Amino acid sequence: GTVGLLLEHSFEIDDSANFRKRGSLLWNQQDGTLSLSQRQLSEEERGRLRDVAALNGLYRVRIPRRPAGGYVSSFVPACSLVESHLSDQLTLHVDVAGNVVGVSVVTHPGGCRGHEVEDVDLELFNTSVQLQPPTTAPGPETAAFIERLEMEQA
Amino acid sequence: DRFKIEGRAVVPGVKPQDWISAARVLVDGEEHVGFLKTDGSFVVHDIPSGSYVVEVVSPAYRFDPVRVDITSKGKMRARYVNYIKTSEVVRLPYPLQMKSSGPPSYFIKRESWGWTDFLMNPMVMMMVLPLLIFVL
Amino acid sequence: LLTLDASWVSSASWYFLNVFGLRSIYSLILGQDNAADQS
Amino acid sequence: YEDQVGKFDWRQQYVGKVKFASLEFSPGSKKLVVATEKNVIAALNSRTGEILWRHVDKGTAEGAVDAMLLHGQDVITVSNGGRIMRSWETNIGGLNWEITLDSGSFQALGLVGLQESVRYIAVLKKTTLALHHLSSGHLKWVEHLPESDSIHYQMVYSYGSGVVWALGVVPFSHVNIVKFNVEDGEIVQQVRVSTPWLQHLSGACGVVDEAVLVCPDPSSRSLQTLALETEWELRQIPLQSLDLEFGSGFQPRVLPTQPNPVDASRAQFFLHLSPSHYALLQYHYGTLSLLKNFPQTALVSFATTGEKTVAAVMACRNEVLACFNQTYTINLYLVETGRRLLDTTITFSLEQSGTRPERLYIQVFLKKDDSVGYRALVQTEDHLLLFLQQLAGKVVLWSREESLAEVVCLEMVDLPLTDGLLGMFLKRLSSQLILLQAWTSHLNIDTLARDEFNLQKMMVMVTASGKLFGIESSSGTILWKQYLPNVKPDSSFKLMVQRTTAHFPHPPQCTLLVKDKESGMSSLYVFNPIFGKWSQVAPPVLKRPILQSLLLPVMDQDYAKVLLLIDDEYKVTAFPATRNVLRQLHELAPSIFFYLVDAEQGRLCGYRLRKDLTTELSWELTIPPEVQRIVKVKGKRSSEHVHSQGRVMGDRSVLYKSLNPNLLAVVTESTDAHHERTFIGIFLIDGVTGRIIHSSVQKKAKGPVHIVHSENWVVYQYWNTKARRNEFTVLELYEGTEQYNATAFSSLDRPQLPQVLQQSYIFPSSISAMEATITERGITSRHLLIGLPSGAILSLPKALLDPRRPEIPTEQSREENLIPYSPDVQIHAERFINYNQTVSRMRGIYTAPSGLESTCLVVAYGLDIYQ
Numbered sequence A: 001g002t003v004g005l006l007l008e009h010s011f012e013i014d015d016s017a018n019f020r021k022r023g024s025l026l027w028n029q030q031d032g033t034l035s036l037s038q039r040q041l042s043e044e045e046r047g048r049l050r051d052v053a054a055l056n057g058l059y060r061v062r063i064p065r066r067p068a069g070g071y072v073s074s075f076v077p078a079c080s081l082v083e084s085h086l087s088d089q090l091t092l093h094v095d096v097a098g099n100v101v102g103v104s105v106v107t108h109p110g111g112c113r114g115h116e117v118e119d120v121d122l123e124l125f126n127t128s129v130q131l132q133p134p135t136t137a138p139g140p141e142t143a144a145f146i147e148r149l150e151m152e153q154a
Numbered sequence B: 001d002r003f004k005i006e007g008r009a010v011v012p013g014v015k016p017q018d019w020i021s022a023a024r025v026l027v028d029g030e031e032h033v034g035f036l037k038t039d040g041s042f043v044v045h046d047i048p049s050g051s052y053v054v055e056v057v058s059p060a061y062r063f064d065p066v067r068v069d070i071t072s073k074g075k076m077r078a079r080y081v082n083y084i085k086t087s088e089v090v091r092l093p094y095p096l097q098m099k100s101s102g103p104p105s106y107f108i109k110r111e112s113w114g115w116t117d118f119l120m121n122p123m124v125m126m127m128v129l130p131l132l133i134f135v136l
Numbered sequence C: 001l002l003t004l005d006a007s008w009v010s011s012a013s014w015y016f017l018n019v020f021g022l023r024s025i026y027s028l029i030l031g032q033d034n035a036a037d038q039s
Numbered sequence D: 001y002e003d004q005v006g007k008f009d010w011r012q013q014y015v016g017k018v019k020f021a022s023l024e025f026s027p028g029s030k031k032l033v034v035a036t037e038k039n040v041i042a043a044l045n046s047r048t049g050e051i052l053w054r055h056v057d058k059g060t061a062e063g064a065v066d067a068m069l070l071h072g073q074d075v076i077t078v079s080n081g082g083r084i085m086r087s088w089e090t091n092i093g094g095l096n097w098e099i100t101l102d103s104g105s106f107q108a109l110g111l112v113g114l115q116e117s118v119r120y121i122a123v124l125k126k127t128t129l130a131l132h133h134l135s136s137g138h139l140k141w142v143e144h145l146p147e148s149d150s151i152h153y154q155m156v157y158s159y160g161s162g163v164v165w166a167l168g169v170v171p172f173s174h175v176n177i178v179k180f181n182v183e184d185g186e187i188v189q190q191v192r193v194s195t196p197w198l199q200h201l202s203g204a205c206g207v208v209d210e211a212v213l214v215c216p217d218p219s220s221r222s223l224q225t226l227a228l229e230t231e232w233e234l235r236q237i238p239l240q241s242l243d244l245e246f247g248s249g250f251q252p253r254v255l256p257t258q259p260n261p262v263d264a265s266r267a268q269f270f271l272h273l274s275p276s277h278y279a280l281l282q283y284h285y286g287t288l289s290l291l292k293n294f295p296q297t298a299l300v301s302f303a304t305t306g307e308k309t310v311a312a313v314m315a316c317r318n319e320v321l322a323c324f325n326q327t328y329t330i331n332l333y334l335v336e337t338g339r340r341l342l343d344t345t346i347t348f349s350l351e352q353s354g355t356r357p358e359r360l361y362i363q364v365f366l367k368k369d370d371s372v373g374y375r376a377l378v379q380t381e382d383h384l385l386l387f388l389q390q391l392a393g394k395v396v397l398w399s400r401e402e403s404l405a406e407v408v409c410l411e412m413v414d415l416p417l418t419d420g421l422l423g424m425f426l427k428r429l430s431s432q433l434i435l436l437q438a439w440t441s442h443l444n445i446d447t448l449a450r451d452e453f454n455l456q457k458m459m460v461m462v463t464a465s466g467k468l469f470g471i472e473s474s475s476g477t478i479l480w481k482q483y484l485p486n487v488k489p490d491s492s493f494k495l496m497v498q499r500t501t502a503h504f505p506h507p508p509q510c511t512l513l514v515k516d517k518e519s520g521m522s523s524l525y526v527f528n529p530i531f532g533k534w535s536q537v538a539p540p541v542l543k544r545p546i547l548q549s550l551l552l553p554v555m556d557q558d559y560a561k562v563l564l565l566i567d568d569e570y571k572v573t574a575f576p577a578t579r580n581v582l583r584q585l586h587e588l589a590p591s592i593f594f595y596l597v598d599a600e601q602g603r604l605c606g607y608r609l610r611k612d613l614t615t616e617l618s619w620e621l622t623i624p625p626e627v628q629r630i631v632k633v634k635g636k637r638s639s640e641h642v643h644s645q646g647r648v649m650g651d652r653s654v655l656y657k658s659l660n661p662n663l664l665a666v667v668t669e670s671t672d673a674h675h676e677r678t679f680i681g682i683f684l685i686d687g688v689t690g691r692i693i694h695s696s697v698q699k700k701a702k703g704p705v706h707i708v709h710s711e712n713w714v715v716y717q718y719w720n721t722k723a724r725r726n727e728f729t730v731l732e733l734y735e736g737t738e739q740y741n742a743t744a745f746s747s748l749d750r751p752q753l754p755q756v757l758q759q760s761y762i763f764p765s766s767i768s769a770m771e772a773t774i775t776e777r778g779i780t781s782r783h784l785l786i787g788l789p790s791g792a793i794l795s796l797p798k799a800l801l802d803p804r805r806p807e808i809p810t811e812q813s814r815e816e817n818l819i820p821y822s823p824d825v826q827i828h829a830e831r832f833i834n835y836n837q838t839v840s841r842m843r844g845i846y847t848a849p850s851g852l853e854s855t856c857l858v859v860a861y862g863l864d865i866y867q
């Protein structure tokens, strides 16, 4: 029915991996919906993110591969995360068999323009969470072609 | 269980001994291969049940591919391939008499336009119509 | 070509430009008010 | 085409390493019948070494030649592990009869004779023996040899006696022999003897004289014998009585002969005591005598001129193991008496180094003066065929480089080039006088020069035999050859052009990266790509196994492109890794990302490049191997350009392509091989941030898949199991009507997922190789070089494969000139870039931009190589 997936974040001055639990993902396989329940950032995390933003570091997310059999991870410029008012979207890519494939995090809007951001802005997690199952590619269209050529012949 | 597809291949006007030296019969896109014997006929062995396109590949003279449907029980039939509207059946005798259709046309002839081709130029007409408008 | 720059020209339009730019030369060398032109 | 055959193009036909060869032919027939490791059966002209008729087979082991025999004028072959036996007419160049055989591992093949003529074939499998007619191949009789469930049969003998000898052994135990009759096939007789020291019969034992079995025993340094005609117990003769000994840690061999199957074998035979050591022994009624001892001789061979047997012995002029200079002499020795022939010695030299002859097949004939005149086909260690003729002039007749049959990687290298104003004017006027004098004066690797159009390049080819070639791209000749000692067949290569020829003060320099699969250790070989010699710059010793390599566009001071390697410990090794190089790539470290695709675990990882030459886990994805295995990781070529960033959509508007230069196109297959549940996935994973742009999965489809990735679009051909038809599927990536980030493109600054346009077409034939046509500036339209199994090269226009072709034409389509969508793709014979120059068993198509803008150089490599 529903499976809970951990989700850790990491951001440091040295840009190393210090993933810490951020939010839980409730993937309900039946209806194909995912909901996250994250805790808001603290002052030190906000502060840590500030130096990471100052030094143009990266913000890395990581989730377990299975509901500790592995992990799938990605990263996003934390300074772009902070210059977007903590507005981002993370897409969960799975496969046809319903197995976790990857996680992609991207801010909104992307990039950076040197916009200074106050601390008060970073007390909300504007996060759009989507799940991306593999999209079946369309096969070649034959019915239209045969009917069309039949009309041409007649 | 394992069946063989027989057939023949003759090029009109050319003896087999002249073209079979560098010709191969392909069963379903090189997935199975066979070689034509001296007389011109061919036999392919080790064919499981299904549908296979048989083509006599020869650089000298092309050959029309033919679909062959062989069943697990053993009965098997030949027909004309059609990747579009594959449900159709156009029966062709099983001892494939794939007569060639002459040498292929890999080359394209030179244009060699004549003065009669230059006579009716679309550009000349489309640029002389304004000339007539300017005069009138 | 499809993506070729428009500044590249074939033979016909080059000849047209040549025939456009030579009337002044004709008047220069042949003589004033020569009859070789395009009107 | 245009009927200008041979004006610019050239094809070379190459067979693989010669697994089995046959030289015995009529003197006027001038034919060689050879079956190679590439499943190819071919006929070579004796005089010049050219193909008469060549018959390739399935690339896999399901058509592998297992045994060749020649009789009269038709050659008889066995393929697919004894499954099929065929008779090929050597004259016409076609089959005579093809017969499938029963199950059971083939172990030995032989012929039988009734009284004087061979008419049937005895083929033995591990559990049975079968007889087939020569005239038609009809099965004569099949007998299951007794007790065969335990014994392993290794040889078959017959002769004019009209009987069949079968021999089987059990390792380190007794062996058994069965007598059958050719007329019926019933077990005439059966005997067993004890051979505690014996290991196997075919490799060690042999049979000479009148079916007399001879096993060399190294345990006691002797020659165990069994007069198989009458004797029922093995006899023993030490070699000390004959002043002979065996080597240490070696298996001695015995080489008999049989001029014709009907007659008994010659009493004399060879014995391979130790490597670089042979003996000639003549067995005569329970005892043997040494005829001639050949020490420090590499290879020996036997031949029959019709009445007498001739032995050819190979050794270099003077031993220095190895050999001083690669000068090998082959001498003729009579077999009746171990006497060297007179004025028959041949001497040749191998061009390469570290290569020694491996195979020697000699063909003999009677000269005008009744002297045995012989020719020798010798295959070296590096898969090279040499035809040596007795007469001194042109001691080699035709040297064939069969090694080039299996090329792993090749590249095209451009040929070498052919304050005060008063000073500037002075030198300019001086140059003017120089040019005037040069004009008025007008009243081969040595002189190699670049063409005006840069249309004549040089191809640096790598061969899995570890051989490097330099082939002129215009004529197809070879300019330089080099050999890499100790290269495993399965080793992985990687060739990189570090410095081109545009830096005259600096030598051209290329780097090849080989990686042994078994060991995992990778090595770097740096060589001049023009001359082929190793550069004096010693490449670094890659201690750790490596995973991936990058050719950074940054160049050293000597205009050598920096190359980066990621080892097993995920460290990065630079090359040349100088202080300037180290500084440049350390200062530009955070903008370098690696991606490693572990196909075994279905994992993709993307690592950064730290300042201090270290990698960190930037992103990681896992495609579960349990449902999907990665089969292709085709990324876009780095050396391409895009002319039109956007495209005109009509309406006086523009649609922007999604030019992502870091876009992977990982294609995976479904581990479910069922014809109804199979699928093929394609993920457009980003190369930097790891984002999956698209995750398409085509259902009810099966590989193999041939995908080309270009500037924007990808095109992957596949098989459709539901309808049994090869299908294309073009994916075009388009951005919005207005570009997001123009000035520059960053994979970290693409929050807008590009839209995907898809379209599936039907291809009415199979495929073997695909590659888009590449131009210098990308102005010229794009074409796919479809590689058909037939050998042709279809030039499919990319404009035809547009996914925007509407199913119903409209005014917008007519304005844009879009053809209505047609699921069928034509294979018109007029589109082939080659006429009849078919490239059998095509492996790849290389497209080079060349100079100009309309001409792209094409090299189709496979069995044949065509340009």
Ligand SMILES: *[C@@H]1O[C@H](CO)[C@@H](O[C@@H]2O[C@H](CO)[C@@H](O)[C@H](O)[C@H]2NC(C)=O)[C@H](O)[C@H]1NC(C)=O
Binding pocket: A087, A088, A108, A109, A126, A127, A128
């Ligand atoms: C998170 O941030 C994004 C980006 O600012 C918000 O998306 C915007 O939504 C408004 C409508 O509310 C649109 O007009 C903008 O064009 C959107 N911007 C984009 C897509 O870049 C989003 O609403 C915010 N909140 C949530 C919960 O996702």
Ligand SMILES: *[C@@H]1O[C@H](CO)[C@@H](O[C@@H]2O[C@H](CO)[C@@H](O)[C@H](O)[C@H]2NC(C)=O)[C@H](O)[C@H]1NC(C)=O
Binding pocket: B060, B103, B104, B106, D005, D006, D835, D836, D837
């Ligand atoms: C078959 O291949 C050959 C070699 O590439 C082609 O070469 C010559 O083509 C001219 C065309 O006029 C013929 O007159 C010659 O006889 C050919 N020489 C040969 C066959 O040795 C040849 O055109 C090709 N044939 C086809 C049908 O493509």
Ligand SMILES: *[C@@H]1O[C@H](CO)[C@@H](O)[C@H](O)[C@H]1NC(C)=O
Binding pocket: D325, D326, D327, D349, D350, D351, D352, D353
């Ligand atoms: C052998 O001697 C010949 C003649 O001097 C020379 O060309 C050749 O390079 C030498 N070495 C080898 C390995 O062939």
Ligand SMILES: *[C@@H]1O[C@H](CO)[C@@H](O)[C@H](O)[C@H]1NC(C)=O
Binding pocket: A111, A112, A113, D740, D741, D742, D743, D744, D746, D749
């Ligand atoms: C692209 O993004 C960068 C930030 O990554 C921004 O500075 C720039 O203005 C954007 N647009 C262009 C056209 O470069």
